[PDB]
Design a protein around this nucleic acid. Structure first.
Ligand SMILES: Nc1ccn([C@H]2CC[C@@H](COP(=O)(O)OP(=O)(O)OP(=O)(O)O)O2)c(=O)n1
Ligand SMILES: Nc1ccn([C@H]2CC[C@@H](COP(=O)(O)OP(=O)(O)OP(=O)(O)O)O2)c(=O)n1
Ligand SMILES: OC[C@H]1O[C@@](CO)(O[C@H]2O[C@H](CO)[C@@H](O)[C@H](O)[C@H]2O)[C@@H](O)[C@@H]1O
Ligand SMILES: [Mg+2]
Length: 580
DNA sequence: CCTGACTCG
DNA sequence: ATGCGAGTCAGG
């Protein structure tokens, strides 16, 4: 615990070796336009600390940073790349990212800093970030001496941990997943985040003004029906109004009291007309707080752009998550909410939004992995299982299936293949439990391969203690052999779902890499804006639409080659809303 | 701060 | 006990 280093005040030649562990410290969680508090470099020649003003204004250091031939090893390179972009500097040459390495080895570890990654290899010559910066209102950058040693130790750890981590990834056959998929994806996500999505605040604000009025009307209507005023957004107060004052049936209780979830309220619709109004109120209320007010709070005034952050090392299945703001959960299911999408527009005049989504993606992936003849045959015949299920459930013809019915059927298809109980299905379709049980049985009867697969994958998981995806992503499930019925059950269902969702995640990620290269290749101006799990959203001049209508679907469909074909749907328009 | 509500894939 | 994976919000 005695590490010597150089607290430099000027950049030297030895600090620019062609191989180094680099630390560009951004303390603020949201690194967009966030300050860089310090720099640390560790290479063949030594350990150095540099103040941001010093290094980032140095022509040789900036050149080194942007030199792809000068290899850098880091932890969360995207954070540094984006922070540097906001500082007008280009970062190239990142050959190793410890965050992604740790993430691939075991998502469950929740590695959020170098220290946490270090503990995976019994390395402890580095402190946790939280211990150094403190938490909450106490969070602060320590005195230079302390800060300097911290950043240098983190760089030292990355320097010493690279081989051990690559070694383990190599043994798990995940080294290519890191070097050829996640790392190149990281750079793509950095570009996407920095580019941002332009927002039509004039329109969003007008929508918010009108929403407030409509919300106000529903609010009064609710108080009138309840014969009293109360906080509708308080499940507690609401419970008293519904189950005590109004005497409605209590269909479910949670640890804190009566449940007022949407599923329960919808079931109480026949008893009082105040329940439908409350449901509507909550929807409108969510639109206002989150998609109007909340979104407006994160819009960069000067450019009218929103810059989300795609967490690439968080989900347990390989998916990405989106935060501050979350642009992966913008309304679309209900027309009222869907209009929020009219506020998301191109960043340049005469540009359009282009959206492409994978068709029945996880059913296709499951057909491949399970090798279910019927299911594979269905996709080879280009059938729509969601629509068919809709036709069967609602007892209607193909042309009588509304997009809403299809969505409900969609949830039924995925719920069944992922282990929904008869109780769950019955409650969802408001049908007899026996009926639901028969529907499920009949479902696997139709797809025996899938049934066998799910049974086998659970057994494999119990023996190996983990499951894997097509591209070797991994997830450990230690609870799978648990004595407790509940604990075990959840683990088993994770064994049934993770490989499928995870593989779908592997595919779209590769599609993004392939698409990006194709774009830069054809010198097209079109560029990715967002990824929404199984869909990619781009913007580009209208003149490039024709090319994209072929390129995007193609690249996405050819990302990987399965036993069944991949199909991509796509549309474009003046706003994200119109891209339908 | 945790719950339970909304939103999406 | 009762498909999976996520984030943000107001109220507790
Ligand atoms: N050293 C390696 C080897 C493989 N992979 C990932 C890349 C995606 C997938 C490619 O597997 P292949 O080697 O092409 O086939 P395989 O390993 O035989 O796969 P399978 O177990 O399904 O036969 O695994 C990796 O990340 N690192
Ligand atoms: N209720 C849902 C909806 C989606 N998903 C997962 C698997 C499908 C994936 C992508 O979502 P969708 O595109 O809505 O599903 P899809 O099968 O691709 O249906 P569509 O053909 O309309 O794209 O997310 C899920 O687990 N449960
Ligand atoms: O830079 C993203 C990277 O950092 C982690 C851990 O430090 O998450 C931080 O940043 C996220 C985006 O701003 C926040 O949602 C999160 O709260 C904050 O700790 C990793 O999880 C992530 O991969
Ligand atoms: Mg889809």
């Amino acid at each position: 615990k005695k590490m010597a280093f150089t607290l430099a005040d000027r950049v030297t030649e030895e600090m620019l070796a062609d191989k180094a562990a680099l630390v560009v410290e951004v303390v603020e969680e949201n690194y967009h336009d966030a300050p860089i508090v310090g720099i640390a470099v560790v290479n063949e020649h030594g350990r150095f600390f540099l103040r941001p003003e010093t290094a980032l204004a140095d022509p040789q250091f900036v050149a080194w940073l942007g030199d792809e031939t000068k290899k850098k090893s880091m932890f969360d390179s995207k954070r540094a790349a984006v922070a540097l972009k906001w500082k007008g500097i280009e970062l190239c040459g990142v050959s190793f990212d410890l965050l992604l390495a740790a993430y691939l080895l075991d998502p469950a570890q929740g590695v959020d800093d170098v220290a946490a990654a270090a503990k995976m290899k019994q390395y402890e010559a580095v402190r946790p970030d939280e211990a150094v910066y403190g938490k909450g209102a106490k969070r602060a950058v320590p005195d230079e001496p302390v800060l300097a040693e911290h950043l240098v130790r983190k760089a030292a750890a990355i320097w010493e941990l690279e081989r051990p981590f690559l070694d383990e990834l190599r043994r798990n056959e995940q080294d290519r997943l890191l070097v050829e998929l996640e790392q190149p994806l990281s750079s793509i996500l950095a570009e996407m985040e920095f580019a941002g999505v332009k927002v039509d605040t004039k329109r969003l604000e007008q929508m918010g003004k009108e929403l407030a009025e409509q919300l106000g009307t529903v609010e009064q209507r609710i108080y009138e029906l309840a014969g009293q005023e109360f906080n509708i957004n308080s499940p507690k107060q609401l419970g008293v109004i519904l189950f005590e004052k109004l005497q409605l049936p209590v269909l479910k209780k949670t640890k804190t009291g009566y449940s007022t979830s949407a599923d329960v309220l919808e079931k109480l619709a026949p008893y009082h007309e105040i329940v439908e109004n409350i449901l509507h109120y909550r929807q409108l209320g969510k639109l206002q707080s989150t998609y109007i007010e909340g979104l407006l709070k994160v819009v960069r005034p000067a450019t009218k752009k929103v810059h989300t952050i795609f967490n690439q090392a968080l989900t347990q299945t390989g998916r990405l998550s989106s935060t501050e703001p979350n642009l992966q959960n913008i309304p679309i299911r209900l027309e009222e909410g869907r209009k929020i999408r009219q506020a998301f527009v191109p960043s340049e005049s005469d540009w359009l939004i282009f959206a492409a989504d994978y068709s029945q993606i996880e059913l296709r992936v499951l057909a491949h992995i399970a090798e279910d003849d019927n299911l594979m045959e269905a996709f080879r015949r280009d059938l729509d299982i969601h629509t068919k299920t809709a036709m069967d459930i609602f007892q209607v013809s193909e042309d009588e299936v509304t997009p809403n019915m299809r969505r409900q059927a969609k949830a039924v298809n995925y719920g069944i293949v992922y282990g929904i109980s008869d109780y769950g299905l019955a409650q969802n379709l408001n049908i007899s439990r026996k009926e639901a049980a028969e529907f499920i049985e009949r479902y696997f009867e139709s797809f025996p391969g899938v049934k066998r697969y799910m049974e086998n994958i659970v057994q494999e998981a119990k023996q190996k203690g983990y499951v894997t995806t097509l591209l070797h992503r991994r997830r450990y499930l230690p609870d799978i052999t648990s004595r407790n019925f509940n604990v075990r059950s959840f683990a088993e269902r994770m064994a049934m779902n993770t490989p499928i969702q995870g593989s779908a995640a592997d595919i779209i990620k590769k599609a993004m890499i392939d698409l990006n290269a194709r774009l830069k290749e054809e010198r097209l101006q079109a560029h990715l804006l967002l990824q929404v799990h199984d869909e990619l959203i781009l913007e580009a001049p209208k003149e490039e639409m024709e090319r994209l209508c072929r390129l995007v679907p193609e690249v996405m469909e050819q990302a990987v080659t399965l036993r069944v074909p991949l199909k991509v749907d796509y549309h474009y328009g003046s706003t994200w809303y119109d891209a339908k």
